[model samples]
Target: IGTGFPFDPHYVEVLGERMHYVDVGPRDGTPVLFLHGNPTSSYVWRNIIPHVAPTHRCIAPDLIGMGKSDKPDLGYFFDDHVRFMDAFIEALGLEEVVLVIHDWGSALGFHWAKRNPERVKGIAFMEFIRPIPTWDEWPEFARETFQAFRTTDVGRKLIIDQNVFIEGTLPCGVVRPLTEVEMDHYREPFLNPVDREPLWRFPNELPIAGEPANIVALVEEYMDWLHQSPVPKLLFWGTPGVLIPPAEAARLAKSLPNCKAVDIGPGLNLLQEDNPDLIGSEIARWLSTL
Candidate 1:
């Protein structure tokens, strides 16, 4: 069901964990790194890669426990995730990066950028949330979804066995409908229950108003970094995103010193699939400004 884009697999040892990534295009070209959210992999960038790879060095890594990356049980928390990213970037000596973040990727990637602002040239974002915006702008359904995941084992079973994250949430997050073939690709990753554990745990990890306190601190730290960093920022939003709403994007744009926002009508899971050429052009144009 995938669009069948060929990806070049690469691995790096970060924090003693073997992280898997797709390294595409010239090694010396200007770097553009794409980061995906839960239940998806580098496959999220299938359409955008070809457009950017021609002129820039593009790298997309699967977060541990998602995609093709090694699923280490001990370090799935947000801080651990960011730490691995920091080490991975340093190991590769990737400098002057343009970060493309989505979903959970925003927290991890933005945190890394804040810590090492000198390494970030710019950022293009989609469907991301800071804790403040999350609490203020999140819709009832979104909150309920998170609550269900955290509260009920039934929710866990639905997400892990039924591919709820990929099938239900992904499609619902988008404003536009994805074709059957495209939906199939998204579902493929969670075909097996074990493969879907990460999906189930992802929402369970959301720090709602820091209720869990642990995740709350992580979100606060990332937001602080976002506010302090001078990196150029661009947001591409899906109008009806299940997780991050348009209001949050607006808030981020208003709060962040150097941030811009754009709406991609409606799409979930894979934004590139909904409007590949548009997203590619948007990123390219945003980079030009930097």
Candidate 2:
């Protein structure tokens, strides 16, 4: 499992936590940042990163409270994540960033782009922000299930007590099941009850009843930025990818000044595992044109 994934681990102090990351490829190559979400880490980028590293500088970070990153006692809110991510950029002094974002990574990257639009070179995203006005616009089962995750007692029992996010959600996200070694990388980070905080906390941040107002505002704010920015954007989607299905993807790509959408087919939310070669090649192809 570790043979071809040669990106070495590195650390940096950001927002009072030691953020862990995988840094690889040519030192002066184009900087492309890969950001994962919720229970995942830089490990999620393993299969795909190696495919892109020969021609691109890949920097993938494990967000605070997830992966090998330090977990503090504070609440794992959207604001907490944004602060740490902002500091991470300053620490690394990254410029003209090309962001490959998925899940909450979209929100974090969009927030950074909105604030520092001049620094963003391109954006490659999939299964990102809630494109609809009503965040509760998910399928019936998904709505009910996530609503339970938002409920105080229910979420703790399911997401924390049972570790169902690792036990269930991760497995459900991808089309294929994870290998034992792959599961170890994701599951090890949140083995302890307290460390599973981010797993449940992220679900709570979704805008329902207008709760987590800051996160809701950030989503709307970045939406406006996405529409206006001239940054070159490459959008990817899998069949049944609820957040940005094909029709909506077309609408979104049309709304942006310089954006294009590609259908990679079949995969669910975690399309990286379902189509690593395609993800790597398409990303590299888009970056080359930029």
Candidate 3:
């Protein structure tokens, strides 16, 4: 949207929703799809895309109801996300995709890949994955904090009333919090309650208690697929993150068909802000070697 960010403005219709995306680089170049989580948009990859764009056509889309994408007044369930994504890939005609995912994007990307492994080449992830099957399955500290956030009344105040996910939680995920301008980049999209619908529904879809049984099962099936598919994968975690830290990270790395691990030293969850150039170049190098 601004000069500082790479790529021209673009949008397409997916399920009657106006989907905004950044599509740049050689048309014939291999496609590298970037998916982001909640409370952020394609802007999340503002820095990372430029590095990967030169060699691979980097395609970053603002999930429906976020960023410049049209915010339809519909429940943003996990099913809603998958349905949009299913149509998104078909609309973009993406194949042999090298997915770069973080946050909800990880879940969506994996969901698509496992079903269409023939169209997938590789995957790269940082923090966030399938919702654990149960609350007790979570760490003691995390279980408590997660419960408090999901508590109906309290959760609304934090997310809907104060916008803690974007303002507070986001900054905490990064060592160097967003600059005022960057902060504005992340904050301006959801200026009101209607616009904030996407963020609100995301926390509700957490697979604790196996409530979102459909997604929980899909992710479980995808886990089985990832373990069997011969596709290449990469995991980057160089800091202490909230959910996907050491053990879980190791589990993903061990289970994937062929996944490599690298430490992005002190690069918190929002590695895009920590040192985009470092993560970008490392990914570029890995892609080149592959």
Q: What is the lDDT of residue 213 in candidate 1?
A: 77
Which one wins by TM-score: 1 or 2?
A: 2
Q: Would you list the C-alpha lDDT of every candidate in the order shown? A: 0.74, 0.82, 0.79
Estimate the Cα RMSD of every predicted model relative to the unseen true structure.
2.6, 1.8, 2.3
**Alpha carbon lDDT of residue 138, candidate 1?**
54
lDDT of 1 at 111: 73
Q: Candidate 2 lDDT, tens digit per residue, 1-290?
A: 23134556799999778999998888895699998986688877888787778888889999999878899997888888889998987899887889999888888998888998999899999888763446556655477778789878988899999998897888778777778777877788888888888899898887655667777777888988888889999898887765666677777877878887888887677878778888888888888888
| Segments in model 2 whose C-alpha atoms lie over 4 Å from true places | 1-5
CA lDDT of 91 in candidate 2?
A: 96
What is candidate 1's TM-score against the reference? 0.88
Q: Candidate 2: which pairs clash?
A: none
lDDT-based ranking: 2, 3, 1
- In model 3, which range of ten residues has the least summed lDDT? 1-10
Error of 3 at 231 (Å): 0.5
**Candidate 1 residues 1-290, lDDT tens each?**
23775886799887777888889888795689998887677888888877788777889988877666776665356666767777788888887888998888877787777677888889888766456434555567666766677655778777866767787877766556768877776776556677676677667677666665777787788778778778788877775665556776677778887888777776654566677788888887777787
Candidate 3 colliding pairs: none
Backbone clashes in model 3: 0
